[PDB]
Amino acid sequence: PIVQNLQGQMVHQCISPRTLNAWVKVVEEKAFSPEVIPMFSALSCGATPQDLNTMLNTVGGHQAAMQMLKETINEEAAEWDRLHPVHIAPGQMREPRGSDIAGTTSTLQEQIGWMTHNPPIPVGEIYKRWIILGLNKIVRMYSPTSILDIRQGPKEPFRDYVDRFYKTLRAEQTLLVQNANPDCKTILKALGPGATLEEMMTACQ
Amino acid sequence: PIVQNLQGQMVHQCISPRTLNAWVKVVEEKAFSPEVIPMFSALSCGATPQDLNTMLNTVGGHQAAMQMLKETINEEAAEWDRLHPVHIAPGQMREPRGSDIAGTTSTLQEQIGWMTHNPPIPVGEIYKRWIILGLNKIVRMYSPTSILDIRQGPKEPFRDYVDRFYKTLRAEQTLLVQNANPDCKTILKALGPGATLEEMMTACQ
Amino acid sequence: PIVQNLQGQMVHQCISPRTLNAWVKVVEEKAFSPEVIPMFSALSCGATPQDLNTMLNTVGGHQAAMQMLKETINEEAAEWDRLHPVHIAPGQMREPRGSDIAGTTSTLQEQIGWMTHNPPIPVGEIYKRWIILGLNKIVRMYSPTSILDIRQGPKEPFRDYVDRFYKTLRAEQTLLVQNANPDCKTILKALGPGATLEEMMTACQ
Amino acid sequence: PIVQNLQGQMVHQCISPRTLNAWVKVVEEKAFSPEVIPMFSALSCGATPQDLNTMLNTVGGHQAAMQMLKETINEEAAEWDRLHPVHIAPGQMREPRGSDIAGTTSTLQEQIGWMTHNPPIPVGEIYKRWIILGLNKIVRMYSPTSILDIRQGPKEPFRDYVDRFYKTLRAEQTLLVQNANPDCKTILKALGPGATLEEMMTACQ
Amino acid sequence: PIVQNLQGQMVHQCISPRTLNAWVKVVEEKAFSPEVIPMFSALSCGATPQDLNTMLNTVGGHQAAMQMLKETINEEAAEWDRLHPVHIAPGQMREPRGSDIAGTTSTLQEQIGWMTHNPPIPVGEIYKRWIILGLNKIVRMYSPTSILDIRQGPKEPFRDYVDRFYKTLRAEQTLLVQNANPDCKTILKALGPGATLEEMMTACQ
Amino acid sequence: PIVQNLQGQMVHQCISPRTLNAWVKVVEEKAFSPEVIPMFSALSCGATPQDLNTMLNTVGGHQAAMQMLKETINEEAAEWDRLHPVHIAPGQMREPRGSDIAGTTSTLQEQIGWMTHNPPIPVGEIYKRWIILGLNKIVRMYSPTSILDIRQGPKEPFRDYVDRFYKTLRAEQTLLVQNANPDCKTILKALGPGATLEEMMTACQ
Numbered sequence A, B, C, D, E, F: 001p002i003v004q005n006l007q008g009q010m011v012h013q014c015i016s017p018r019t020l021n022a023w024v025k026v027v028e029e030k031a032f033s034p035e036v037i038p039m040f041s042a043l044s045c046g047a048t049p050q051d052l053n054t055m056l057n058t059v060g061g062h063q064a065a066m067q068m069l070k071e072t073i074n075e076e077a078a079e080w081d082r083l084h085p086v087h088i089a090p091g092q093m094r095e096p097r098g099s100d101i102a103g104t105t106s107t108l109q110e111q112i113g114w115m116t117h118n119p120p121i122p123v124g125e126i127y128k129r130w131i132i133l134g135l136n137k138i139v140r141m142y143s144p145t146s147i148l149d150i151r152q153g154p155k156e157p158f159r160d161y162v163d164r165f166y167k168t169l170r171a172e173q174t175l176l177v178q179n180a181n182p183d184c185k186t187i188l189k190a191l192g193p194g195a196t197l198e199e200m201m202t203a204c205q
């Protein structure tokens, strides 16, 4: 990543073993559960494109997903090249192409050069946006169940139903009342409109 | 977070993998037991609003609770906008709205700018107060038992009863004597008024 | 905590996740065994009153004990207010009350201000003394057995008896000879007076 | 490794126990799965040739592979000597041979001298390229199955088939449609040409 | 401990949670096996007397041993007072007594003052010597078996016998040949005198 | 160890708990497998002789081996004294003897003095060479099997045979073809001379 030192210049630092290990584990344990994406974003804070490629490449399974991500990345790179065409002056900074931003045709030195320039071309933040676009599509695709099939069981506590319901909504990116069981539905209808979630859960406890 | 370096300027530092992992674990193990809230507060020391969103977003279950928290946050943001209306001068710091404080409409750079300004607008501390308000409501809601149903069993050591009693009081945010068993109640009545907890526990040992 | 940096000023540092986790574990594993108190003292080195409250508040069980501790803290605060009454000059340091020292009516900024003042008012060290007073009472109260009931078994090695004996003495805060079994007692009587513990253990091996 | 300090000079730092342990583990757990190579590259960031030899030498099994790697390294060193022949001036930097780059005939001091020279001779990056060439051959050799033998089972979800298919392609360094089962193949034929992987997976869900 | 910072002054640093935990574990796992003493010495590098008391006090079992250690410490303190009697000048450093060195009658500030003085009075190194004297006696006392009872079994490999033999010698602080079994003894007699241990082990393989 | 700080002077640093623990574990798990020696070398980077003694002394078993190592060290020290005889000028650096290099008759201060002198007498690197000489002899001695007894089984994959073969060669510090099974031997004979290991393994797959 690029960090500020103790004396206030922006410098390159090796990706840490703890960071590498945390990512691989979270993917092993959680696959593409929606909470994996904010974890990715936080572990890749200050990342160069090389660091972002390292994190993606260290994943060993889920190679269907990692291929779909490559496709999304290539579409975003091609749209970048559409908006930002490029033509080098000895010793001068060249302009990045899509593939430079994705770290396939750029060196670490060029990446540091762009990201620390005054003003900076934040190639790591741009690439991370493309990656997260790609990851969100994967989360949606690997969502097991439609929100239409989340209905409260006759013996299911209302709290457990609401947990399943919002978990599903998150992955898919008055239905709550419609899908409640007969007993809670009756209570909820009687609360009248514009009830908060806290009030609905309280009433159905 | 925003930290002081070794040479005494306030600077942004990446959230650490250890911090991220500690929070997710504590939520996995303890759900919304009341001791989870001081742990949240300590792990989020120096946090920007972006860091606070990261910590909340990395939680994978309990999505009913995380929705109720969003509701509380939106009420606090709306009250902020009531007390602090806003109208930008090239190169100058804009005034934060509620949604800026909650980190949904503000950038990390703006967040750092507010928090390090002379004098600072402590947007991370303000947002953390809203979050903790929301978390306290969740702790109360997920409290399993009323204090009225904590009564000492005929064979239950007085110490174990007092542990259950104050554990319940904490989550709900002379009853101790009333709810004691016949044998301890008699001892306790005879101690006369204004006995410390240490004396009551000693007497009932 | 308040630490010295690499360049020799006293500065505030966030409590670390490792410190938070170590305390909670030691309390989970050892409850109020006497060795928990030196561990508390070492983990809270440089602590502000806010840090000390964090460590106490992150404990989830033992709420009878944590209530008894609050009582001890309130007695020490009230004695502080007796010895050190207080009456603020714009921009000047106010004098701390008992509740300021215990961190319930003081801010982190005021706490840092006192502890780094020339000369310092060491509010973290004062509060830690009150806490340890309270913890020692809890250790004594949760001591399972009287020293009078620690007697060497007919088949119990003398070493194992002495371990039980001094473990009990520690928690309760010639008896060793009196409580020995017939065979060791005879050996020990014959050593004559003023024998070291090493000599007694050697003789009874 | 060679790192930048807090005050911006390039200096030698000991390889950390965490780095040493992470490599040995990943090799214990994953053998020569293709994802082991980006992990190697990331753990050896800033490495001197001595550090790279340390990491390879700390592997205890897989000695057939480690011998094959030595062979690849010796071929790359010999090609280096072909392109860059060498002839020492008291106190002056000598030119590195192949075996100097591989760290068998060079000292740590000479290695630091080359890598920190203005302009630097990046002997650690050159050696790492040779090592990765050698590792890629090993990954290909230890690939269990041909891509021709990855075919979708009659009851196998299309997602699981695509995961096996791209996992195999990665290790080997319209076939996807040809190797699909009758039911998915029919769906896929009907999508018409130039379908993305996302569309194929969606259609076959 | 007292450490050198990044800018070369000797300063006090909190004992780390990792250090505290490592000591307690090693004592839990290894009791007073002789290898515990070099581990103690290494974990207490730079220790103040307060740090050394912390490490000893955090041990929860083995209270017979910890009492025997107190006795040894009190004898060494009393011998110190014999060799170095003491008589304070406002603002000046007082001379340490035995109990000051053992950290029972001295403050952390006084301890730092002695250890960083020009020239320093190394109170932490002096106390550590007393502690190690005491620990060595405990290792000897808890040694299970005499070296006279370590004899090679008729089916016991010579290597395993030599491991038991030197393990016992270490704890107790031509016998090797005398205690060998008939078959190895014969081989060893025939090697003639002044054979190295390597030669004896080779011969008996 | 002796490290460079953030501001570029060579200074003494305490051996870390992580380093101490990593060594003890690796010896517990791997005994004197050949890969233990590069691990020792990497964990002892920058070590003083005191640090090297700490690492050796913290090993609890294998006391036959640790005695054989002492013997090797004493022979290397005696050869040092042969090549470098010594005769002290107030305040001046004395010349190290063998036993000074092995850290038995030298203090930590003298050790730091030698290693940081201009030009340095690298007593830690010299001692580490003696130790590694001694360790290599132990690895050879504890090698279970001769290379002559590594032969491919009738049903043993060629890869697994080559792994056993080079593992044994490493510990002992056309035979591969001679010891192959009939079926692979035939294939290998037919490849003709000067085949790489990769080609032999490919042919026998």
Ligand SMILES: O=P(O)(O)O[C@H]1[C@H](OP(=O)(O)O)[C@@H](OP(=O)(O)O)[C@H](OP(=O)(O)O)[C@@H](OP(=O)(O)O)[C@H]1OP(=O)(O)O
Binding pocket: A016, A018, B016, B017, B018, C018, D016, D018, E016, E017, E018, E019, F017, F018
């Ligand atoms: O951030 P973490 O993955 O939780 O690991 C930390 C980290 O070590 P790594 O940089 O090797 O990962 C610390 O280094 P810093 O963050 O302070 O630079 C180190 O602390 P030290 O500075 O004291 O070496 C500490 O080790 P310690 O146990 O000594 O506190 C260790 O945590 P663990 O070794 O407990 O996993």
